[PDB]
Every structure is written in C-alpha cells, then in structure tokens.
Amino acid sequence: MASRLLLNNGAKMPILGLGTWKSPPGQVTEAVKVAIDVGYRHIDCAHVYQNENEVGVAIQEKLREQVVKREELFIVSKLWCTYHEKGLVKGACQKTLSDLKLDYLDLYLIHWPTGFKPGKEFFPLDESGNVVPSDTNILDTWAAMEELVDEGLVKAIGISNFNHLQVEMILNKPGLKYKPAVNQIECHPYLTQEKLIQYCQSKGIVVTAYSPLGSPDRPWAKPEDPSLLEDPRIKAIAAKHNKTTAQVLIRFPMQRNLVVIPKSVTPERIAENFKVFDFELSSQDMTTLLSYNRNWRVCALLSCTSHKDYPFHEEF
Numbered sequence: 001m002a003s004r005l006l007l008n009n010g011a012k013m014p015i016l017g018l019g020t021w022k023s024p025p026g027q028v029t030e031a032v033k034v035a036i037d038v039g040y041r042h043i044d045c046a047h048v049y050q051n052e053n054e055v056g057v058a059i060q061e062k063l064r065e066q067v068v069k070r071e072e073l074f075i076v077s078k079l080w081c082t083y084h085e086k087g088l089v090k091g092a093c094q095k096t097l098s099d100l101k102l103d104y105l106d107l108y109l110i111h112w113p114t115g116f117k118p119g120k121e122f123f124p125l126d127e128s129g130n131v132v133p134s135d136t137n138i139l140d141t142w143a144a145m146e147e148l149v150d151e152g153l154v155k156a157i158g159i160s161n162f163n164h165l166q167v168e169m170i171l172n173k174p175g176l177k178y179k180p181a182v183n184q185i186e187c188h189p190y191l192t193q194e195k196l197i198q199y200c201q202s203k204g205i206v207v208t209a210y211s212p213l214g215s216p217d218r219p220w221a222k223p224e225d226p227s228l229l230e231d232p233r234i235k236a237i238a239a240k241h242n243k244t245t246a247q248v249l250i251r252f253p254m255q256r257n258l259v260v261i262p263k264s265v266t267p268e269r270i271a272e273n274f275k276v277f278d279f280e281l282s283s284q285d286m287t288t289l290l291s292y293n294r295n296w297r298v299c300a301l302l303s304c305t306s307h308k309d310y311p312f313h314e315e316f
C-alpha cells in the first residue's frame, strides 16, 4: 500500500508517524533522531507533552545533517485547551514553532473540544477540584485556527477527540473557510470506533489512530488492566505472519485507511515499528481484530466529565 495519503488541502500525509506523549525529555531527542534515520517522516507532537524543545533538537540536527529535507517531513502539533481564546491561538502556535525550531507546521490540531481558562496551569481547577471552562465557542477557536493557515504558520488544520456531533458542528460552521483535514482519535482493537471513523471518512476527513498499542505506559494504568501486546489472540495472528504483536497492531489501522502514530523511546522498537510495509493482514484477520472491541477507552479525560464540551458522553 501507499506510504502516504491525500489530505483535503492537497498535501500528502505519511500514514505512519512517531508519537511523543510520555517520551522523557532526556530520551526523546535520540528517539526522534533514530526514527528519522530508519525512515519515519511524520512526528506527532503537542505543547502539553512538555518535550517539544527536545523533539525540535532532533529535527533540526537531521535537517542540518541533510538526512532529510523539510519538505519531506510532516510535523504535527496540537493547540492546548487553555489557549482556545481567539487572541491566544497564534501565540500558542508560535511557541510550538519556536520550540520545534520550524517556520511552519504541516498540521495543527485542536487538542480537545474542551476550552479551559487561560493561565499557567494546563488544568486550571476550582477550589472543589473541577476544571475551569472557557466561554470561547469552539467555532471561534476554529476561525482562529483558519487564520494560522492564511498567515503561513500551518499548512493544514484539524481536530482531536471530537465526537461526531462536534465534528458536524465545525462542518456546519457559518462561513467555514477550511474544513478539518484530520480528526485524531483513540483507536485499537479494544476501541474500534467504526461509527466515528465511517462518519469522518464519509466527510473526507482523514482519521489518525492514537494509542494503537493501548498506551500501556499511561500513568493511570492499573496492574489488572488488559494488555493488547499480550493478548494471546493477537499473538496468534502475529505468529502466523512471522511478525510481532506490535507490528500487527500498527498494520491493523493502516488497512482501515487510517494514519497511525505508535510511541516509543526504545531504538529497537522504533525500528521494529516501522517494518510494517512488507506484509498484509487478510480480510479475515481484519474482521477478527475488529471483533475484539470492548469499548475500552484509555484516554477518557476523567477529570473533565463535568465540562460542557466533554466528548465521550455521546455514543460516538
């Protein structure tokens, strides 16, 4: 299959990227360098991950060494919730550009549909522990995102963790200038997301699957929680194809026409994760993997369930 797919801005996006959430600042620079050395062209970033400076060191060195040209890279970042106010969007984007040491992003996403009160704290709380919302309309945040395109700071704009009604809200925005190119959502065999994916694909929005290995290093994981990497049923499919369980899990969303962004800071796994273009899962393998859906969501943003725009009360 093709290594890239077409976005609605006319640009091509690599279907495999390196994720960077939870990548420690002292390891992520080498992780990104190794990834580029072994062929990765797409890096997934965010201000809220607190490691964009270190990711940027890697990118700049590989550009300087001429291992890769800038035109060949596809760098994604995300607008954090405390910057939804129209007057704060450009500055948030500029800070990410400055840290990553780039003059443009290929894709900039609204990280969550929930706006929070601006300030130093990424999750501003009231005295009772609830997150403090922003009154800024998501449609006004979208207009501010559209300005970044017209100013040359980003080539394309998109959304993340938007449910189908929230996606519909943007597509129906009065005076909509640029459609979302991408919706980035959790997706793995325990949360297959058929309804939201088909909706987005029906609208011409490309879906990026995050946490495709089920984010076993997430901070709130419990010892008894399921593990995709150790599921014997997935291990069997992997063994059959002479591949690893991670390679199956990465190949899975690729054959659903999704982009996928597995995270690792381990050089061997970074290399292994990229070797998924030389085999094919059967339609039977695909349907079997899809059958494992348990609606098991690992990124539920549990501290914000009271927020007006919390996306996961809705069925899809």
Ligand SMILES: NC(=O)c1ccc[n+]([C@@H]2O[C@H](COP(=O)([O-])OP(=O)(O)OC[C@H]3O[C@@H](n4cnc5c(N)ncnc54)[C@H](OP(=O)(O)O)[C@@H]3O)[C@@H](O)[C@H]2O)c1
Binding pocket: 018, 019, 020, 021, 022, 044, 045, 111, 160, 161, 184, 185, 209, 210, 211, 212, 213, 214, 215, 216, 217, 229, 246, 247, 261, 262, 263, 264, 265, 266, 269, 270, 272, 273, 299
């Ligand atoms: N938009 C959003 O709201 C959102 C939310 C979550 C994630 N994301 C993005 O999606 C990316 C990936 O999701 P994620 O970080 O949650 O989790 P993930 O990619 O599902 O899993 C990462 C974990 O799997 C391990 N791993 C990676 N490759 C492996 C392999 N070949 N064999 C065994 N273990 C392997 C990693 O270990 P080591 O790192 O120690 O090798 C790490 O512990 C994120 O980093 C982020 O860029 C976005």
Ligand SMILES: O=C[C@H](O)CO
Binding pocket: 021, 046, 299, 300, 301
């Ligand atoms: O991308 C990271 C998300 O904010 C985790 O909840």
